């Protein structure tokens with residue numbers, strides 16, 4: 089019933105705002121007019137990106153921004169709401185460039201959330217900006233608060249939420265209330281920073297949009313799919329950093345929740361969220377990439393998958409060798425390591441030497457250039473069928489993607505997502521989800537339904553015995569136990585009645 093969210097980032101750099109034009113793609117490749125009425129109808133949210141936090145610890149435009157041109161761009165976006173009364177134009181604060189641990193504005197994020205007075209000044213500036221520019225809600229993309237900063241981040245979200253709710257009442261906006269989201273970590277290493285307090289982080293949000301992409305890249309030793317739905321036992325595996333989070337759980341509880349090593353997949357991130365009590369499936373949104381990540385220096389044998397590679401990891405890209413054959417946008421952007429889906433379609437179609445291959449465990453496509461030794465991991469309308477089916481089966485809130493300019497000209501990726509959720513004639517009941525590796529962790533938030541004989545006082549239970557008691561099914565950790573389940577450390581809660 090409830091419509092799935094379809095949240096697309098609209099990113100425009102300052103120089104493009106300051107020189108905004110809808111009639112020159114060499115100046116602005118993706119002007120607002122490319123978001124046609126048909127596309128507008130298929131989105132529920134557009135995340136305008138990025139604003140920042142300044143040294144005055146307020147939400148702010150990049151100070152080089154021409155304000156009149158900014159308002160003009162934003163006005164074109166909010167004009168789209170004429171075609172879709174469900175559509176929201178959010179704005180996003182942060183992004184990797186501004187907010188990463190070494191980013192140019194990082195200290196402003198740390199300081200803005202640090203004290204009650206700072207949080208109030210910061211929260212106020214967010215709602216002020218929202219009202220002043222005509223936005224419909226606030227998205228926070230801080231990558232990422234460290235475990236020490238998490239309490240301040242939580243309080244900042246809570247305070248923003250109160251101010252948004254006030255604003256909704258003031259504007260009589262109950263039909264389309266102002267919203268709050270974050271872009272959340274989609275991989276266990278960064279997720280471990282705030283994982284233990286995930287319920288408090290998600291409580292004030294309408295959605296947490298998981299960045300379930302960038303799970304492979306040149307910083308890793310071995311090529312891999314950047315957004316595998318499920319795991320491939322042939323691919324690399326990773327230490328499960330969540331088992332070291334400050335949860336206060338027992339060895340058995342930790343082990344059951346956090347297998348290690350594990351496959352870094354979209355399903356892993358989603359299940360890791362669902363394991364936590366107080367994190368509802370309907371607030372979890374699955375991020376998908378509208379771009380691929382490209383690697384060079386790869387060996388043959390498995391289509392370039394799971395190979396060592398010679399892809400520079402430095403930022404900015406360290407020379408002028410744009411080796412991703414056929415990638416014209418890569419030349420424009422001086423970086424052969426990222427290619428939009430729009431460009432990847434053209435690369436396949438041209439005489440450039442790529443084969444499109446498919447991994448039926450991960451349910452994702454990849455390109456392999458056998459002659460030069462290149463590998464590209466990306467997503468397409470086919471991988472989106474499996475991801476859409478997972479979103480529905482797991483009762484997730486919807487899909488998020490980065491970014492709108494990377495869809496092809498006809499908006500085929502966006503149209504596919506909309507079709508999979510909303511087309512009366514689309515049927516995926518027989519779509520086979522495959523035998524790729526599922527993340528099997530169980531935690532307090534995702535106990536399965538079970539039945540077992542009622543616990544009987546006086547009975548001596550062997551290790552592994554299952555009983556039902558006071559609403560749950562419990563398993564003895566060793567034998568021989570006679571205590572009431574939940575009264576001491578001998579029983580593990582394994583299911584709910």
Ligand SMILES: CNC(=O)NC(=N)NCCC[C@H](NC(=O)C[N-][N+]#N)C(=O)N(Cc1ccccc1)Cc1ccccc1
Nearest residue numbers: 099183184185229231271299302305306379401425426490
């Ligand atoms: C919604 N927020 C996100 O999606 N964030 C996110 N993906 N953060 C991590 C990715 C940062 C990315 N870095 C690289 O790609 C490293 N280069 N290499 N190899 C980045 O900062 N940019 C490229 C990018 C961004 C998002 C998704 C894929 C690639 C530069 C950038 C360009 C425009 C806006 C923001 C960042």
Ligand SMILES: C=CCO/N=C/c1ccnc2ccccc12
Nearest residue numbers: 302305306307400401402403425
């Ligand atoms: C490859 C270009 C540099 O951009 N890198 C971003 C980055 C660096 C290290 N680890 C990461 C993990 C996830 C996403 C991005 C990165």
